[PDB]
Design a protein around this nucleic acid. Structure first.
Ligand SMILES: [Mg+2]
Ligand SMILES: [Mg+2]
Ligand SMILES: [Mg+2]
Ligand SMILES: [Mg+2]
Ligand SMILES: [Mg+2]
Ligand SMILES: [Mg+2]
Ligand SMILES: [Mg+2]
Ligand SMILES: [Mg+2]
Ligand SMILES: [Mg+2]
Ligand SMILES: [Mg+2]
Ligand SMILES: [Mg+2]
Ligand SMILES: [Mg+2]
Ligand SMILES: [Mg+2]
Ligand SMILES: [Mg+2]
Ligand SMILES: [Mg+2]
Ligand SMILES: [Mg+2]
Ligand SMILES: [Mg+2]
Ligand SMILES: [Mg+2]
Ligand SMILES: [Mg+2]
Ligand SMILES: [Mg+2]
Ligand SMILES: [Mg+2]
Ligand SMILES: [Mg+2]
Ligand SMILES: [Mg+2]
Ligand SMILES: [Mg+2]
Ligand SMILES: [Mg+2]
Ligand SMILES: [Mg+2]
Ligand SMILES: [Mg+2]
Ligand SMILES: [Mg+2]
Ligand SMILES: [Mg+2]
Ligand SMILES: [Mg+2]
Ligand SMILES: [Mg+2]
Ligand SMILES: [Mg+2]
Ligand SMILES: [Mg+2]
Ligand SMILES: [Mg+2]
Ligand SMILES: [Mg+2]
Ligand SMILES: [Mg+2]
Ligand SMILES: [Mg+2]
Ligand SMILES: [Mg+2]
Lengths: 54, 109, 119, 44
RNA sequence: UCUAAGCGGGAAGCCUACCUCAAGAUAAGAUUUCCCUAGGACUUUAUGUCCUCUAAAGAGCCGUUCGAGACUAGGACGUUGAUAGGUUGGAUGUGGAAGCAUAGUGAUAUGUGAAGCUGACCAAUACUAAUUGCUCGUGAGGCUUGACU
RNA sequence: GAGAAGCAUGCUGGAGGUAUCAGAAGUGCGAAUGCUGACGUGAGUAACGACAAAACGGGUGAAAAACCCGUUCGCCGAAAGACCAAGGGUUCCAGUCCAACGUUAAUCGGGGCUGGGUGAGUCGACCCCUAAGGCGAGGCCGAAAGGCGUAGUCGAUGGGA
RNA sequence: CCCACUGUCGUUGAAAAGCCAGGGGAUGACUUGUGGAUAGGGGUGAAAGGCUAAUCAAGCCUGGUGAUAGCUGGUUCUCCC
RNA sequence: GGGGAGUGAAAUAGAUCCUGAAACCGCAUGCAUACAAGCAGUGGGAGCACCUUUGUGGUGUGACUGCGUACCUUUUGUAUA
């Protein structure tokens, strides 16, 4: 139910050794020149040579 | 020469912000701005605010060029907590600490 | 186990799920471009393309089927006058699902759903 | 669950008020005590 | 005289034998195949450092997904494409749709017609979505002995 | 220096400190399930309070799953609707703000700030009348303090335009 | 409407006594609002030592009071015999 | 919320504002650490890094190795589970 001894600050940092974040897949849409998330519509509505909500 | 920006009193804990601060430490300023732009974490917004402020200070007060800049230093410290009460079952009461942080960015060529 | 099973649950009862997908189909047929979550968008194809396939033949039984399945007279009128004759010579694939980032208050993956030859 | 307080303002005054305490000797001693201690409110 | 020397038989038991795992077996094994062969300075003089040039074989991120799955990992595919959805045909289940016509006072019955509808199945089919990409991974791999050259 | 300890000096600090020899003590802390404050481990883990249920388009905004407008879907309907008494005390309405408060965000709010808002011969209270019960001039009783009670006077939950 | 016989759940609860599904009484020795009376060795009790403000084989608050404890715990700098 | 400018003797004297300790939590540099079993020290002792001198010097780290079951209390007697 509960610990008998407190955890050292070393064993607490050893558990967090898998807690790191990674980056996303970002590409340059040289149809428009901007940076965008791969396979996603850009911030203003562009994708692979088409524009939504002109 | 490093140019500094401080964001004192962010309403997040330092353990949550250190994860985003580890992602951009030592990178070029444009790449770090991209990483922060396309993040779903809440600490990314505050860290992007502090980084934008450091770039503006470097270019206005010190008159530096931006494509040469780097995120040379960044670290997160703890702020002062807010103490609150949470009623529990059977008449018991727990103490809630609402945590705070200080973000410090240093941009340099 | 889930071997070779189709359909979603999406946290709802069967009847709520049916009602929600019918509502989505009606909204799509009216506006022709809507924004939803990606798991809701990919299951909407399986609900909304059969209605267009059905509206390609304008008989009284087909229109009564479309009304039993949409319960919306404006949608039935738009299917058998506009949408059916537009795709009369297209062999399926009348929608388009496009990933569109994440929701602010939620961090939920979102998508655009649009009709193919709109505007 | 029904709890113990169950307020009524007439009964509050008739059990604990100023005239109730002034109508006996031990109540006048309650009032003398509470004036010696410096309370900002003598009674309920 | 079965034992002291020497030579044997003997059980669902032991070791093999059958199935599964297994080189972190730190002694980290083997076999087939594939990839990398640019220049300058330089001194803490050695698998030494610095600057331009280079970025392979491959792996991963991402996407469409699975008879694989808690998250992972693992399998398949990403336009020179059937990976998923839809579309078209088939199969299956249910059991005689709607409209119309006829017979009947009516409930209803009959014909049109085993009709209409039919999740997850089989087969075809680029109609929709699998992109223009990015990151990692280098530039022949110390020394000493002994054999072949 | 045998020890409790002492001496010198760099940095910070910004106004007091004190030899020697006597004198007086709130004179030395690790423990008392000791007392007060602060901060850890558990752990970014359990949980986010009725299984009535949501979806989309537009607006405003720095930012919208949650606010406003619209179009649909769903739930209660002897209650999850309307109204009095008690209790509370401005929560009511408008403009404006979003730090804290709201188990998430909030542009919203029963939150902050600035103004506004409750109109009676007939509704109610007060008022006249009394029940139970209280207090009670004189009076009876009691070391004192005090107890009971007559005439009276109060006291609605009941009677009176 | 008043009650509380059984069971599952809940037991750092939605809750310091509940929910849900069933259960009993339901014109009476009934249920209930408002006001009042009884006060601690006392009251009240179709009686279980029950209740008397989440407290009952003698309520709570202040005082006597720093009660007493042949019991348990704790007791702080250095050196020498 | 900060960065310049400006005030002031002083701004890590800037309003949570004299001084600013410890527990606790970061970032940076050096060395060690992914074939090895236990109160984490102690006696040895190689290597590396930085200062310095021409060192049988100083500072940090510590491969490998002998020995080694916390403190208080109470007990005949406690690593004591
Ligand atoms: Mg650390
Ligand atoms: Mg409570
Ligand atoms: Mg499948
Ligand atoms: Mg869910
Ligand atoms: Mg139903
Ligand atoms: Mg078919
Ligand atoms: Mg039918
Ligand atoms: Mg003392
Ligand atoms: Mg202490
Ligand atoms: Mg202590
Ligand atoms: Mg755990
Ligand atoms: Mg868990
Ligand atoms: Mg959970
Ligand atoms: Mg809720
Ligand atoms: Mg009913
Ligand atoms: Mg109501
Ligand atoms: Mg209001
Ligand atoms: Mg909030
Ligand atoms: Mg208000
Ligand atoms: Mg009056
Ligand atoms: Mg009397
Ligand atoms: Mg008298
Ligand atoms: Mg009267
Ligand atoms: Mg009345
Ligand atoms: Mg029940
Ligand atoms: Mg009955
Ligand atoms: Mg008593
Ligand atoms: Mg008596
Ligand atoms: Mg007694
Ligand atoms: Mg004492
Ligand atoms: Mg200072
Ligand atoms: Mg200070
Ligand atoms: Mg090793
Ligand atoms: Mg061990
Ligand atoms: Mg003993
Ligand atoms: Mg013993
Ligand atoms: Mg021993
Ligand atoms: Mg043990």
């Amino acid at each position: 139910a509960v610990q008998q001894n407190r955890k050292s600050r070393s064993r607490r940092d050893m558990r967090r050794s898998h807690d790191a974040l990674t980056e996303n897949a970002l590409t340059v849409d040289q149809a428009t020149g901007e940076t965008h998330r791969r396979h996603h519509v850009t911030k203003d509505g562009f994708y692979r040579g088409r524009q939504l909500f002109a | 020469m490093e140019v500094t920006a401080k964001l004192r009193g962010a309403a997040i804990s330092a353990q949550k912000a250190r994860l985003v601060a580890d992602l951009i430490r030592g990178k070029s300023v444009a790449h770090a701005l991209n990483i922060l732009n396309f993040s779903n974490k809440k600490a990314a917004v505050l860290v992007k605010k502090a980084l934008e402020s450091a770039i503006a200070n470097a270019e206005h007060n010190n008159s530096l060029d931006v494509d040469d800049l780097k995120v040379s230093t960044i670290y997160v410290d703890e702020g002062m907590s807010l103490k609150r009460i949470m009623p529990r079952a059977k008449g018991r009461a727990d103490r809630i600490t609402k945590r705070t942080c200080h973000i410090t960015v240093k941009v340099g060529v | 186990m889930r071997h070779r099973n189709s359909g979603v649950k999406l946290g709802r009862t069967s009847s709520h799920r049916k009602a929600m997908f019918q509502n989505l189909a009606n909204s799509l047929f009216e506006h022709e471009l809507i924004k939803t979550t990606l798991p809701k968008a990919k299951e909407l194809r399986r609900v909304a393309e059969p209605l267009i396939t059905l509206a390609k033949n304008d008989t009284v039984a087909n229109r009564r089927l479309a009304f039993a399945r949409t319960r919306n007279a404006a949608t039935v009128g738009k299917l058998f006058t506009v949408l059916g004759p537009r795709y009369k010579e297209r062999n399926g694939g009348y929608l388009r699902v496009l990933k569109a980032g994440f929701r602010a208050g939620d961090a939920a993956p979102m998508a655009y759903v649009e009709l193919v030859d709109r505007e | 669950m029904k709890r113990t307080f169950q307020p009524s303002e007439l009964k509050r005054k008739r059990v604990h008020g100023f005239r109730a305490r002034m109508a006996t000797k031990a109540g006048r001693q309650v009032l003398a005590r509470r004036r010696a201690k410096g309370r900002h409110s003598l009674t309920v």
